[PDB]
């Protein structure tokens, strides 16, 4: 009732990675010094099962969003089932695939988290959406420090087979319960009301603005500074207590190809924070308000996670087969990511000088300041880990999801190699050959979540998400008459609203 | 002795809001796309008592500013006396007011806040300063989201009715115990140390500071780089462990007519946040200090919270008739609002091209920064609402007073309404008459704030705040002679000195 | 959370009906003979609420369609509160309201049933949808069996 | 609606005839005049309704009832300018989907 638990299950397929063996992966050394990676490439798979549609159907996402205001995932439960090792002996072009029950795959559980995270940057190979399917295990693989291609020298590699692990066989299944230490509930809930309105018309504030710096007089304008009373008449001079959320302006790009320039400045006009001499583009953003209201079509440039619908290439895809989120229930309080957050007078005045004024491009946080944290689509990660250093601000990461210190350890599963016909003679060098072989099946994870319940004693009738009542060829959400899942929309997480 | 009760009763007087029937209200649409408001007005009265001057007598005011260092509201105890309700039957001229016993107002007190807060904002219709005066109840309102005038969709209305109720006759009373649940005690104290002077003279630090780039050499200046030890003769580039304060940069205004620009920058040149397409200005500030040291005539264009004089039309009003605040206790660790809050490289030097530097009008929050919040008046409101979001930064809010996750709730008083001589027939229409008529009397609210004991163990006789020997016709705070009570100058909270 | 309870409050009037006397009622005999009706009109007033939007709000009525299969009425609690009977006395064309403390008001249940029921007809003066309304209680009447007015 | 043998009886109410005046001579007639005066104020009715709770375990994302986005002069349910309260459209009962 108060708390809601998700069980998934899923069949899965680990083939063997990189030979059995470690290899470092570089840039092709063709790349701009922006984009070079040092990092290394490693036997073992892992599970990513962080997305939010792993664990729930669109019907219980659905349940999950307009009937309560915040949920946050208390315990996770974890084990695989029916492992069973496959091992493929290729002659001529039969595949000839063979089951043996001796050999055995080995699971690693990080526990303490020794290795590289490497989750909560929304990479494929998670659990499909759809249960039906089976996943390919996704290659592990971490990266380091570069200098360039070269790899300075703090660079580690954590060659992962070192750390104590227990082997499965065929007929082995293990299961370990992880609970999330804690969190905020997220926030299910769109804002009533803006902060810039908090405030009843009918009772004008007892405070003034300077309402005329000038007046007439002999037709020339007198000096003379005058103040009044903020109230109804006029809103915008009226004092109030907060500020809008940090803002770190992006570039708006339209949806209709004729208003948008035509040149590249995708990567020059668009916002990056530059570090360590390489710059970064800024893809997810600090959580910024989509669009101005009345345009849903301009949206900025980076700052919406956009999410593809399938069968989409990965190198170049036209606007039609990408799906664009939507941050516009954020309005109220953060600025819009392409709008200024304010301006700001450069100058001071003097009987020579006029006033002058300054837009402020990116504001950074001041006290008395609140801001509501980016939506988790259906499509999005549902957790990142923090990472560990001295400082941080406000956990919460920018993809989305919660922040967490100790995150779901990411358990590394590779399938034990086996060589193949050793030479009869002895010889010094390590095995060249080996049987082919992989294993697959049953993963079956399952989350504990609380929910916070909505009470909400609004008299009108709420907005929630429901499907459309219009005849389709295809109903979204359904699979596609070839048997292919489909997912024809981002769900954002907040349709319900909570006065501010 | 610890903590100190402050008790006030005073009389009020509900008139009929609205007729008994909701209203929407909204923008004249002359207005500009910045001002806009599509919210509701509610039969519903609310008491708001949120003001200091309410509770505390300029004396007691006075005796809580200089005997001690901080206070914050522990509990409040709230209770209404001797309600009764005026028919008034009006004929000719007549207005025959008459009592009836029968006829009940109903109060309405939130407990867990479902309807919009509406208060912290500095509206009228507080309690009034001096007990012998008898106020109007004020009307409630609120607004949510809208496009111009129009209500977008998410826009709920609450409807006050609905939620339970206890009615009230005459004879009866109703009280509610609020307790605070916790706030940082207000900072009663300015610094008698500057942030940039943190340091003894005597003992010179053990750094270097770049002194001369250049030396002479055969008239030309050679290049030679050169480093000297921080100490009591250069204090500007001895280092430091902290950061002043936040800055967003306002506008100056001197209040001499002459120094003042001749033209209209009321609205442009003043500093303001745009928020979903329609900027807003900031009346209240980032607590800002107010004015440079030895100037006491500069002051920001917004920033400093103006309270009016009484007696002074809120239409336009001239400079002599409000009375402005002055932060000049916070000039220690916050930047002044109008001047910038320093200077930034902007580009590298070579031999080629000279250093170059542009100042930083607007500084967000660094790490290792500290701030003095601003100063609670005795006309300011002692809560605001932390409105409630998935995050926030130092919730105490600008305005001034205790950031509150729970603030007290504001009850809701309604008269009810009692139809006048029903037709004989019967009709489905709801009634258009009303008996007139309006209820009043004797609200009492009592808070227990926590006193923090200034001990100063400083030699030097310490600023008080005390009334001026001089004579005058009014004595301050004094009633004037056609009974009128008046206020001349704002209260600083902070006259005491304390080692930063 | 298995069980939903919705309470509402509503202020209503209750006029003097029929000069405190019954009257028969009958069609003005210019009807066809398909629409006659003999019943007779009563000086007593009775409460509507059999309406839904009486008792869910539209935002309860939402939460209430979608989130669950199906809803019955267990129980009702019945209440009304500060009764105040207002006297009329008009001279001139002064309304003059005066109240009074002594006039009593007579309620009657039916626990059960010996009169014609006389609801679920879904006729007008029920509690109104909105809670800031104030309703004039409905007339009491009821038909019997005729032919043609008799 | 729900079909009930036994219904909530409905409650009837009558404010009591006060005489007006009554002549000091005696007279069988019954009395022609009374008080004008009417009754008023504070009905208090709360049901308790059972719900049987939906667990549907379809994957398609279910209908639901829901306001529309589109911005409106005055918003559905709610109150006008004027004070009139107004509903817009009836709402069914059954948005849910059941396999029958």
Redesign the interface.
């Known amino acids: 009732?108060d708390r809601v638990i998700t069980t998934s299950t899923r069949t899965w397929a680990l083939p063997t990675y990189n030979n059995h063996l470690y290899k470092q992966i570089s840039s092709q050394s063709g790349a701009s010094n922006d984009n070079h990676y040092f990092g290394y490439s490693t036997p073992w798979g892992y599970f990513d099962f962080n997305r939010f549609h792993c664990h729930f159907?669109?019907?219980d996402?659905?349940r999950l969003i307009?009937?309560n205001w915040g949920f946050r995932p208390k315990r996770l439960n974890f084990k695989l089932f029916n492992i069973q090792v496959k091992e493929v002996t290729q002659n001529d072009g039969t595949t000839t695939i063979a089951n043996n029950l001796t050999s055995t795959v080995q699971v690693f559980t990080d526990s303490e988290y020794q290795l590289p995270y490497v989750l909560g940057s929304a990479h494929q190979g998670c659990l499909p959406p759809f249960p039906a399917d089976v996943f390919m295990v996704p290659q592990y693989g971490y990266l380091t420090l570069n200098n360039g291609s070269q790899a300075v020298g703090r660079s580690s590699f954590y060659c992962l087979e070192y750390f104590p692990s227990q082997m499965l066989a065929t007929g082995n299944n293990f299961t370990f319960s992880y609970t999330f230490e804690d969190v905020?509930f997220?926030?299910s809930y769109?804002?009533?009301?803006?902060?810039?309105?908090?405030?009843?018309?009918?009772?004008?504030?007892?405070?003034?603005?300077?309402?005329?710096?000038?007046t007439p007089s002999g037709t020339?304008?007198?000096?003379?500074?005058?103040?009044?009373?903020?109230?109804?008449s006029?809103?915008?001079?009226?004092?109030?207590?907060?500020?809008?959320?940090?803002c770190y302006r992006q570039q708006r790009v339209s949806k209709t190809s004729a208003d948008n320039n035509n040149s590249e400045y995708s990567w020059t006009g668009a916002t990056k924070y530059h570090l360590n001499g390489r710059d970064s583009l800024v893809n997810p953003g600090p959580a910024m308000?989509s669009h101005?209201?009345?345009e849903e079509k301009f949206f900025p440039q980076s700052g919406v996670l956009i999410f593809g619908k399938q069968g989409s290439e990965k190198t170049n895809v036209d606007i039609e087969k990408v799906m664009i989120t939507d941050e516009e229930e954020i309005?109220?309080?953060n600025?819009?990511a392409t709008?200024?957050?304010?301006?700001?007078?450069?100058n001071?005045?003097?009987?020579n000088?006029?006033?002058?004024?300054?837009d402020?491009n990116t504001?950074?946080?001041?006290?008395?300041?609140?801001?509501?944290?980016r939506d988790v689509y259906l499509q999005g990660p549902i957790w990142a880990k923090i990472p560990h250093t001295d400082?941080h601000?406000?956990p919460?990461p920018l993809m989305g999801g919660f922040g967490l210190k100790h995150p779901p350890p990411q358990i590394l599963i590779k399938n034990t190699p086996v060589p193949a016909n050793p030479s009869t003679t002895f010889s010094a060098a390590k095995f060249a050959s080996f049987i082919t072989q992989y294993s697959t099946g049953q993963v079956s994870v399952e989350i504990e979540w609380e929910l916070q319940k909505e009470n909400?004693?609004?008299?009108?009738?709420?907005?929630?998400?429901?499907?459309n009542?219009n005849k389709s060829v295809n109903?979204?959400?359904?699979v596609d008459t070839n048997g292919v899942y489909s997912e024809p929309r981002p769900?954002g997480t907040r349709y319900l609203?909570?006065?501010?």
């Open positions: 009732g159907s669109p019907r996402w659905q307009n009937n905020p997220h926030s769109a804002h009533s009301q803006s902060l810039d309105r908090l405030m009843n018309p009918l009772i004008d504030q007892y405070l003034y603005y300077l309402s005329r710096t000038n020339t304008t007198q000096s003379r500074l005058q103040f009044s009373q903020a109230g109804a006029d809103i915008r001079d009226q004092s109030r207590n907060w500020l809008p959320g940090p308000a101005k209201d009345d309005r109220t309080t600025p819009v709008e200024q957050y304010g301006s700001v007078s450069t001071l005045q003097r009987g000088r006029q006033a002058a004024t300054a402020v504001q950074g946080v001041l006290p008395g300041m609140v801001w509501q944290d400082g601000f406000h919460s909400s004693k609004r008299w009108n009738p709420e907005i929630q998400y429901t499907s009542y109903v979204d959400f359904t769900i609203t909570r006065n501010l």
